[PDB]
Every structure is written in C-alpha cells, then in structure tokens.
Amino acid sequence: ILLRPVDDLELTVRSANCLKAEAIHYIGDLVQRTEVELLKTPNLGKKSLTEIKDVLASRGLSLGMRLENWP
Amino acid sequence: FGIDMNTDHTLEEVGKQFDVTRERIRQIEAKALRKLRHPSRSEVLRSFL
Amino acid sequence: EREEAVVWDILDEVIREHPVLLNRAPTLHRLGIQAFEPVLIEGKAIQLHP
DNA sequence: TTATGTAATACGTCTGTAACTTGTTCTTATGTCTGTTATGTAGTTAATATAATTGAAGGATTTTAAGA
DNA sequence: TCTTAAAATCGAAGTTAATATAAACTACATAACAGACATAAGAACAAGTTACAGACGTATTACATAA
C-alpha cells in the first residue's frame, strides 16, 4: 500500500487538487507529513483533512509514522 | 449496455427512467466509466483481456 | 501450458487419491477394466502391476 | 474597585471550488431511395434418325416361407 | 412332406483423413451494387444553478492595567 500513488485513495477533487498542488504524490509523502503540516496547505481545511484521515484509516494506515530512507 | 436485460437502450429511454435529459445521461455514464477505470477497482476486470 | 512447478504440486494433490480405470482390449470379462491409484512417473508409458 | 484595553476563542460568513444540470451546436454514422449493370430465366431451332447397361464373381452356415 | 430361392450373420481396439469421362442465341425481368441525401445519435463547449469549503472577520469573555 506504501507503493501506490495518491489517487488510489480516491480523493475528492478538492483534496486531490490540493495534494497535487503541493507535489505530494506518494502515500509515503502523505504519512511522513503531520496534521499541522497538511492544515497549513492552502485550501486544505479541517473537514478535508478529516475525510483524508477517515479514508486513509480505512486501509489500515494512519498519519505521522516515520518511514526510514523513504524512498 | 443491456446487462441482465433483453434489449440494449440508447440515451432516450435511459433518460425516460427518471428525467428525460440526454447530456446528463452521457456525463453520468462517462463519470462511471472513469470511476471504474481507476486501478483500485479494475484489476478483476483487467484479467479478461 | 507453461508447465510451472506449482502446477505439478497441484497435479499431485488432485491425483493424490483419485482412482483411474485401466482397460485393455479385448474386454473378455470384467477384469479387463480395473481401478488403480495413480503414481505420477516420468515417461510416456503406463506402468502395470505384474 | 472599576474603567480600560489587550487577547483567546467560538461562531457567522464571504467568497472560491466544485458538483448537477441544461442549451445548443456541430459532427458523424446509418438507413433509405434511386439509377445502372449483371444475373437468371425462358422459348426455339424443320435432310433423318425409332427396345440400355455395366459389371461380377473360391462363403459357410442356419432359419423360414413359397412351389409342388 | 420334399425342393428352392431368399434372408441374415459373421471379435475388439488401433489407424485412417477424398479426386480425375461425357448447343447456342435471344429476349425479358429481376436482383445486386453503388452513390447521395436526410436523419438520428453522440461529442464538445459553454453557460447557468446550487451548496459547501476555507480561511477571514467578528463577537465575546477573561485577563491585565489603569485610576
């Protein structure tokens, strides 16, 4: 799952839009960032972030883990 | 496409289901098509090539 | 068709206890057809118990 | 003590994104009509000529109907 | 009661892959093939209608400061 691109998460056009604007392309890039780092993204609000959290937690994953030597 | 159905239907009678509008039916079908093309729900269908 | 190894293990598991019927013509009596447990062998000839 | 003024904080909210939907407008695939050529059908020919036809072959036993 | 012609039967697999002779002209109607046009179906763009998001601005309360 760590080797799939972000679009696989099936994000709302608002979300995928924002994360494609910050060059966050890979789920490792999603997880190594924290909640506050994402909430600082322009046009990334609280409810967008909470739906990212819900969908990513659907796949047994969570925010904030440290991945060594990524990638 | 006529799945589980005797006949195939064009945009007209597909609209005749709830609202008789052509371009909405087309856009709905295209949205469904790119949604299915998503690599997450198409591996089971790609095996039939 | 590619004859992979796992195909061979699967074949062993299917033939593990599936009997096969051996026949020789002319079938003069009912002993001309009998059931045997197959053992997979390399070759092209059927090995028959004496 | 109490006005005052800064500051945290929670809630409206104005605006920027995006979904749903229709107009309409243009393009193309298809069904149909029409004209022309090839195909398919049919009728006729008037010295005279007048009982096929081609094979094919070392069978050995039974049972069952016709003929007398 | 005795010939005499017919009728029927005659082991399994296995393999196997065929041939090869012998009217014409004319007249008519029909079917097929090609081309062009109209129509129905879809593709493309643009607009409108609508609610929600995202961060800002505001309002409220509590702490600090001033009298």
UniProtKB/Swiss-Prot annotation, chain A:
Disulfide bridges in this chain: none
Residues passing through the membrane, by range: none
Spans annotated as Alpha C-terminal domain (alpha-CTD): 1-71
Recorded domain comment: The N-terminal domain is essential for RNAP assembly and basal transcription, whereas the C-terminal domain is involved in interaction with transcriptional regulators and with upstream promoter elements.
UniProt function note: DNA-dependent RNA polymerase catalyzes the transcription of DNA into RNA using the four ribonucleoside triphosphates as substrates.
Family under the similarity heading: Belongs to the RNA polymerase alpha chain family.
Subunit-level organization: Homodimer. The RNAP catalytic core consists of 2 alpha, 1 beta, 1 beta' and 1 omega subunit. When a sigma factor is associated with the core the holoenzyme is formed, which can initiate transcription.
Record's protein name: DNA-directed RNA polymerase subunit alpha
Gene symbol of the encoding locus: rpoA
From Swiss-Prot, chain C:
Top-level taxon of origin: Bacteria
Parts forming coiled coils: none
Described function: DNA-dependent RNA polymerase catalyzes the transcription of DNA into RNA using the four ribonucleoside triphosphates as substrates.
Subunit structure, as described in the record: The RNAP catalytic core consists of 2 alpha, 1 beta, 1 beta' and 1 omega subunit. When a sigma factor is associated with the core the holoenzyme is formed, which can initiate transcription.
Family under the similarity heading: Belongs to the RNA polymerase beta' chain family.
Name this protein carries in UniProt: DNA-directed RNA polymerase subunit beta'
Encoding gene per record: rpoC
